[PDB]
Amino acid sequence: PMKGRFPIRRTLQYLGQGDVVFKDSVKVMTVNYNTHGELGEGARKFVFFNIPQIQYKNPWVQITMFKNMTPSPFLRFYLDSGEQVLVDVESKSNKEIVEHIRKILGKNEETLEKEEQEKKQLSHPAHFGPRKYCLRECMCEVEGQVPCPGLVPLPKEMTGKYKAALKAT
Amino acid sequence: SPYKDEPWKYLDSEEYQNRYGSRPVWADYRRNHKGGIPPQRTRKMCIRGNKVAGNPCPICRDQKLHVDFRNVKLLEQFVCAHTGIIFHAPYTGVCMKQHKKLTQAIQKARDHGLLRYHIPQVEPRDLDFSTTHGAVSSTPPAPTLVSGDPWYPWYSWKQPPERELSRLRRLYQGRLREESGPPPELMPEV
């Protein structure tokens, strides 16, 4: 990327390196911030940097911006059970908010690592099929077993053409 | 050629040093093709029968070179020193028949330890080494196993009562087949 102020924030690595995963009960995040004043530096930098990372990890969570409606920047979270979480940011920096958000509503490290651990067992190594879903495609790709007749031609005694010839004779 | 006894003798010979020198065999060979991009596949073979087909490949132009697993100096020239991967056919220019020979010879040589290749450090297969579990330790014999009796009563052959045989004969009369007795216990060999 050439255009833009910070082209690095528009690459797949930057979108994927942000680790903030909301719980299944989080649906709506509303961010209000001001375009003037030194107090809103943390809020504006949070919108300019971290929000793309947050949305990429939570595709199903609505994120809506509102500019210059409240003198004090804040973040509002709407849960599934109607619960409202209000986060107040007036001097916290860009980094602080992400750490604060990750603790009130983010998922725990043990929960994330066990979630993908249970995902691994779906692609069981012992199965056969297409390359996109299974490792091997046939039993001939295992050393020791009878190889595919395409690569190594089979002995005549095992070919069905020879088997039928002797039965009819 | 009188070099089948020791193929590596030619590599240590003075003739090889005089001609090729320090550089590999395929250094002075250039492949003539149709334009800027060479075809991704070289000649299948250039030694068809007894006729040498045009400009030969580096290995098929001097017949004294033997592609075997004993000599490592020749096979080292076709393996990257740093990356440790086998050069493809377009990189050198050898014919496809000899390229297959090189890959098999290199693979055999690495299997015999004559050539060095990377060996990653591998963790042990299991986390806990316990032989206590019953999958590997011997389980107590079944009461029907020690006695020698079959595992189920109906596995063996039992003579039906004659009343039941008469009933079946009446039901399936006309289409009846010859009955048979108990099966032999052991089958002899022809």
Binding site: K120, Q121, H124, P125, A126, L135, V142, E143, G144 | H82, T83, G84, I85, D111, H112, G113, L114, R116, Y117, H118, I119, P120, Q121, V122, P124, R125, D126, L127, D128, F129, S130, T131, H133, A135, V136, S137, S138, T139, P141, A142, L145, P150, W151, Y155, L186, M187
Partner: protein, 292 residues
């Protein structure tokens, strides 16, 4: 309470016995090379980077477990004489499930005689590899582990690689693993190539094998010639722990010395050839006094 390889006492002795050479433990391997990454660091940050490598080196130096020979499996679950000649080949059934550890899986073979018996260790490990493949393990026994091929690798001082192939291919408690490791340890002893496995993670295995075979004469001579004495006496200290009821360990309680005198105790008590040991220790002493 017999000594075991996992004890904290023996592990701490062997951890400082093998040493730590960053250059040798991190050697550029023959793989797909990628361009290096450069960054600017101060003096303080350089030590932080160095100590992280030390921690990574320690994890990379986890010695493989060493066990005794496994007992063969001879168990018959059931016998069926009705299927004596129904089939010619034998069926092998393997229970596959991602949740069951490989040590608890059921591998049961139906012999053509009709006997439902568990699979032996030789075939049990083969079946697990077939249905649960992993890097470095061949289904059939590679030709590299024949006696003829090992000598070719040994003549090319490939001892570190042979051990690394053996741990990946065979099971640590298997019979083939033991005979290959013992053969490798025997050969390096004959040629005095103990320097090859200095920073190698496999150094604990050969030291433990020597302390159980009562063959420390060769190893102690090399360490003194390498001017590594502080760890040399630790090796002698290890000997007393493993073999307490002996004349050498009795002297350590009688005389109650320290330093190089601990080697002198063994050199004159249980050492099979103490003439070289005492002379080399004498050679070290005079040289060290001159150096100091």
């Amino acid at each position: 309470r017999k000594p075991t390889f996992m004890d904290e006492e023996v592990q701490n002795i062997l951890i400082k016995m093998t040493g730590l050479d960053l250059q040798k433990i991190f050697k550029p391997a023959l793989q797909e090379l990628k361009p290096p990454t450069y960054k600017l660091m101060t003096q303080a940050q350089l030590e932080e980077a160095t100590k992280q490598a030390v921690e990574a080196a320690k994890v990379r130096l986890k010695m493989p477990p060493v066990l005794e020979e496994r007992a063969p499996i001879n168990d018959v679950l059931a016998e069926d004489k009705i299927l004596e000649g129904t089939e010619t080949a034998k069926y092998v059934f393997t229970d596959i499930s991602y949740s069951i550890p490989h040590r608890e899986r059921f591998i049961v073979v139906r012999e053509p005689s009709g006997t439902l018996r568990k699979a032996s260790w030789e075939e049990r490990d083969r079946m697990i590899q077939v249905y649960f493949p992993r890097e470095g393990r061949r289904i059939l026994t590679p030709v590299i582990f024949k006696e003829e091929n090992l000598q070719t690798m040994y003549s090319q001082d490939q001892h570190v690689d042979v051990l690394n192939l053996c741990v990946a291919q065979f099971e640590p408690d298997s019979a083939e693993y033991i005979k290959i490791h013992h053969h490798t340890y025997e050969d390096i002893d004959k040629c005095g190539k103990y320097d090859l496995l200095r920073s190698t993670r496999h150094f604990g295995g050969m030291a433990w094998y020597f302390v159980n075979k009562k063959k420390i004469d060769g190893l102690l001579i090399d360490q003194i010639q390498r001017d590594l004495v502080s760890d040399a006496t630790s090796l002698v200290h290890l000997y007393h722990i493993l073999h307490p009821d002996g004349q050498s360990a009795q002297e350590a309680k009688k005389q109650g010395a320290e330093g190089l005198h601990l080697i002198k105790v063994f050199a004159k008590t249980e050492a099979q050839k103490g003439a070289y040991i005492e002379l080399t220790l004498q050679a070290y002493q005079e040289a060290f006094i001159t150096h100091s």
